[PDB]
Design a protein around this ligand. Structure first.
Ligand code: NAG
Ligand code: NAG
Length: 162
């Protein structure tokens, strides 16, 4: 019902943002994706972030018009990262007690929409999200000039069949 990510340090409740997108890195009818650890420069090539600076997930960025869209400089080269832009932003709510919470049902539908787009692009039936420096292995984001780190293993640890 709710996914509760542990965070360090405790992000204030007004640091809660909107997940407008993320960045993946591709590793049969089974293709595996992981949250990218590339530098914030590699984040820039997605061109869908807003003002906040964040790893693994795009907070407070731009949304797609109708449906989820995925872009890549080259789908053949796996070193190139996949830029996922959400159509409906998923809300991440920090409570100030050391955890930022996300609704499980909405992230599941988001992962299913992403899987459907990744299925059309790679022709595979099964899309698997596997977990990921500490700044890039975690969902790290800058709120109010202060940096935070959240364990994102709960977000990227699922499977999605056809
Ligand atoms: C994202 O935007 C919301 C609403 O504008 C704001 O409350 C929140 O602090 C922003 N997130 C960051 C990390 O600045
Ligand atoms: C962005 O987040 C704010 C609160 O943090 C929320 O009111 C707003 O609906 C979110 N944006 C979208 C498009 O849902």
């Amino acid at each position: 019902d709710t996914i509760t990510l542990p965070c360090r340090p405790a992000p204030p409740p007004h640091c809660s943002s909107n997940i407008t997108g993320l960045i993946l890195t591709r590793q049969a009818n089974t293709v595996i994706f992981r949250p990218s650890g590339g530098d914030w420069r590699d984040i820039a090539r997605c061109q869908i972030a807003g003002t906040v600076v964040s790893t693994q997930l795009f907070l407070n960025g731009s949304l797609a018009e109708e449906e989820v869209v995925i872009r890549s400089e080259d789908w053949r080269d796996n070193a190139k990262s996949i830029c996922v832009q959400l159509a409906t932003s998923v809300e991440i709510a920090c409570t100030g007690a050391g955890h930022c919470a996300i609704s499980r049902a909405k992230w599941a539908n988001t992962l299913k929409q992403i899987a459907s787009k990744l299925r059309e692009q790679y022709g595979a039936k099964t899309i698997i999200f596997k977990p990921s420096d500490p700044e890039f292995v975690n969902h790290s984001f800058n709120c109010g000039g202060e940096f935070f780190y959240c364990a994102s293993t709960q977000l990227f640890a699922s499977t999605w069949f056809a």
